[PDB]
TrEMBL record, chains A, B:
One of its GO terms (molecular function) is choline kinase activity. This is Choline kinase. Belongs to the choline/ethanolamine kinase family. Residues 69-92 are annotated as: Disordered. Keywords: Kinase, Transferase. Coiled coil: none annotated.
Amino acid sequence: VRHVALSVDASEWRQPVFKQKVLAILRRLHVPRWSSPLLTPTNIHLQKVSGALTNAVFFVSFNPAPNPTSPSESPLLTPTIPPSDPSHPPPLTPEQYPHTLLFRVYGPSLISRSEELRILHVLSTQYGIGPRVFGTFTNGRVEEFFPSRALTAQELRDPIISRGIARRMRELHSVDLRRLGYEQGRATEPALWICLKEWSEAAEDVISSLTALGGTLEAWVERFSLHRIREEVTIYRNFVESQSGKGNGVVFAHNDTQYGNLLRLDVELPPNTPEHCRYIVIDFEYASPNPRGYDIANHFHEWRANYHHPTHSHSLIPHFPYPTPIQREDFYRSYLSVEVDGRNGEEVVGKRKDVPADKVAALEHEVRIWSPGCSINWALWGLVQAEEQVCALATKKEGYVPEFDYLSYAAERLEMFRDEAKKLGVPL
Amino acid sequence: VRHVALSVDASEWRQPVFKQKVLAILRRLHVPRWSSPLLTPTNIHLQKVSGALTNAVFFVSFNPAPNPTSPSESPLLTPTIPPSDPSHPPPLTPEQYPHTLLFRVYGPSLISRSEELRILHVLSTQYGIGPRVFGTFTNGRVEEFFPSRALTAQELRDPIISRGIARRMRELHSVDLRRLGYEQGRATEPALWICLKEWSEAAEDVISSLTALGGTLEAWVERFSLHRIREEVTIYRNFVESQSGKGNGVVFAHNDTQYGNLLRLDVELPPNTPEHCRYIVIDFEYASPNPRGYDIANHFHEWRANYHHPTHSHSLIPHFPYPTPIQREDFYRSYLSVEVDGRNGEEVVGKRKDVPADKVAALEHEVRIWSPGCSINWALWGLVQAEEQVCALATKKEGYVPEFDYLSYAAERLEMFRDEAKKLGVPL
Ligand SMILES: [Cl-]
Ligand SMILES: [Cl-]
Ligand SMILES: [Cl-]
Ligand SMILES: [Cl-]
Ligand SMILES: [Cl-]
Ligand SMILES: [Cl-]
């Protein structure tokens, strides 16, 4: 995998130097067509993909005009081709136009990028999962963009799309964890527990600024009793491990199947290939060993929309419905109808009706047991993202309005955890 | 440009070993996606493109099914995706499916392949012309196929398509011949003359088997007086060089713009990009320095269809009409409305109406002067392809029926030459 030792400043993406540095990276990576010596940075049609939280993602597609386009924001959707100047054609004919790319810029940060790269490499070459990476640069990487778009929240409950999502996760979960570097395989410890320990310690660092001020803000931390969380994780963990239906260890989980990381491929499928195969999962930033019921339960929470992803303060929280018992069963049947022979890797697909009911009900129990974990997971993740809001609140920076209210985000998910855990049977 | 030292036997293209060797070449070339270790030769959906004469050309596209498809013949047209087996999916999801390739296998043989490669490299990197070559093997090369199809004979006279063809040739002709290795630039000797000398000497070798037998076959050679051709080339050459309107030296000519080497690109063009830009020229096997009027006159002859390309004996010779004076003028206006600044390479496109009439009429005279050359060119090329038919005739191989009647092909074009040259003014 090719590498170039150059960086971009994502905060400068609206400036010409950004296109100059992008082009330099594409040339040194020998990205085809983009490396043509006949092009210059003005040929970069640049868009920032909205809804990314941690990292900045950009579309890079071909601008045929002699003068540059202004950079704009856009959703995750195949860029429209910008107009040309008929009197000053580009130096290439259309079959040579450069293809569209995803240009990922890392923020600061789970798994490392160097380990994420090695995993992505195994996933693609041994299991046929993941994007084509043209190369990496100092703080990001460059990927092929296949024409496609993100799903909507409404599309998660479509039975055909839901069926495809269940298939793709099953395919993810059939990856041999040993090939990824986890020596213990299915007996590896769930990444959930390590995430709750690290983020609860960081959460404590963040909210100590509120406590130290006393008064109002300390009262807020006490109203939502944020210090007893460690004592509530441990009680929940002891209940889970004490369950016989907790599942057989862990699998390679995506851990973040919100609709923004689910793609509809814009492609003509082969004859007989089912409609639900045009759907795939993207963005493995959070992927790691976890119980399969955790990954699935997380997806079901994501039916409600803006579960992991926070809501902007100027928008209404979506609130789509959680899947009913039969929609979850449709999901399980689709999920379990796919078997991958571990010896040779062959995938065989069977009828959903032939899945046995004890297998379907056992998976439901797994989901039920791991589902509260997803909420405390994102709750503690929320308190960590609140570092900046807290720092402002503690300083009383005039006129500050946070882009996301992560404090409220965390309270809400913490109460989701406490409530689902109580109704599950956890003595919290 | 990557290279692998392996060969294929094009005569074995219907056999499994052919797919095995194709896959081996794609891996060693590191063709993306095709190099995936999850694929095998049964994933090669293989088609032989019809209408190739010298060399064998194959489509290589993705077969998703566990069992191989049978190899078939096909025209130059984007292969349909063959059906999959829903119970045994391919090991890749659709965004990873390998793209379609052109797999060219050379026959025996103008310019060399090693020089053709260096020229193709200059044409692509400095002028934006030509195919993306993934790599070469011992007797061929592997190219990207962009979705597209060959034109039909009927489409050559469509004013929009004709306009695009004229543009693309102008763009070809603006190439600096010095960048291609021809030190003398526009003063380089026309390749026509070297082709007529070499092929007339080979023609003589071929037809000497007919003469040596006497009787019938010698009478045939005398009926079409094939020995006085050298004396007729020289007379025609002295008339041409004596013309003041012969044009200003030579340009990089394609020399073979039959409809089979003209492509309609299947692509969504940028806004404001004119319809005729979806048309391009392919296959540079015959390209070389020649007078621009020669290349254009050759294209006009090709309006009649099956000019260069022979007709199969079981088919009727097409016989579409030659372009009228105004269709040729439409062609000249479109051709001359494009200027490429030689200093910096910028292309500017103007209105066809603003082309001056003296420039249009001067180009017509160039075409008229060089047009008989095209017929003697293909006539002598025909006598050379007749080696095998003559060898059979001279042996009286029982039941022999030639795939193409090259002897008749050559007589016909030789009389086209003699007739157009007489009506031009050549004392032949
Ligand atoms: Cl590509
Ligand atoms: Cl163009
Ligand atoms: Cl399939
Ligand atoms: Cl490609
Ligand atoms: Cl598939
Ligand atoms: Cl244009």
